[PDB]
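Reproducibility note. Readers wishing to regenerate the assembly model reported in the main text can use the exact inputs given here. Chain order matters: entities are listed in the order in which they were concatenated for prediction.
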Amino acid sequence: VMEELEQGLLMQPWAWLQLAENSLLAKVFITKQGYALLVSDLQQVWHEQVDTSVVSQRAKELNKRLTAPPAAFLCHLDNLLRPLLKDAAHPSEATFSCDCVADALILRVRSELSGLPFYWNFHCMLASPSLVSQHLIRPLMGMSLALQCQVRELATLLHMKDLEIQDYQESGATLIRDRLKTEPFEENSFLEQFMIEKLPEACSIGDGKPFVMNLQDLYMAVTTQEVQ
Amino acid sequence: MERKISRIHLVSEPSITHFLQVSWEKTLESGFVITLTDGHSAWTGTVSESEISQEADDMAMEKGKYVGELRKALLSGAGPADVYTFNFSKESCYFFFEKNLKDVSFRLGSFNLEKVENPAEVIRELICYCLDTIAENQAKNEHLQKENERLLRDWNDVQGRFEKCVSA
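Running the prediction on these inputs yields the following structure tokens for the assembly.
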């Protein structure tokens, strides 16, 4: 139960949330026994794990007039949230708002179910140092190392290709098209040029959209490997 | 002045049907009067603009959407896929209807009806209204059928004359 939810949250990819001009990065894991949520804004990380009793109590308090078993509530919440997180630009039906309490965060979600209002509230406390570390720092660390290894392998491939180009040029005919000529690859020169020119835009985090849009698969793979 | 009679299956005794008649002046927004009957005893109640507005506000719903949902539920406006469940506690004289939504039920309306001492009068009035409307519908159908037959005969005659003219 608890371990199941923790593992499901760990092995989930980050998703982008837009709400009242604000942006957030959210990971969600729903199950019949409860749900786990981890939200962040690149400055603070909040985590909330809720079981059957808490979800039932909160649903009764919020939806005064929605009598249903907690499992059905969890299933409906999953059906409402998962498609939105997975793909952006989805038909706008789930409105979100965030209230930043002095310590906690209140995420209010209002949606439509068969034309009827449906309210829910996530009361997220500040994430524990261990959870935030395990969810962001170590996985990001692994992705950085894996990308460094990828760059090294691609540099080796470029060295092989440059050697073979030199072999062709040493004993070969002229080029049918002269516009396809390429200069020899230098790792130091390429690194310096990239750092001087395109690092300011390449490393621009912004609001977190590029991170979720670009390299979520690597994050998922690194987290799955770390699990084992 | 409009009125609609509908059939319902109370969950307390889902073996014998009940009939509910709801009458309104222009639209359900302003208000209406509802009367539930089962053939032996009847109950009556009224909903005003203030009551419906308060219920909608408690629902945090748009007035138009709430009115449309009420029309669908009460006027037998069943959609392609939607089930509404009604139940009337006789001991407390409390009748309320909910929108069953595949294991998640959302209560839609609730009222307290007063047991009218005389059910015979309301049953007789309902029967009289039904007879009047069926007679009116029969007369309208007869008139429309007669007009259609006459128009068809005229069209046949004109078509024949047109054929003769084009031939000539």
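We highlight two features of this model. The interface with chain A takes residues 58-61, 65, 69, 82, 99, 101, 103-107 of chain B (CB under 8 Å). The CA atoms of residues 42 and 109 of chain B lie 19 Å apart.
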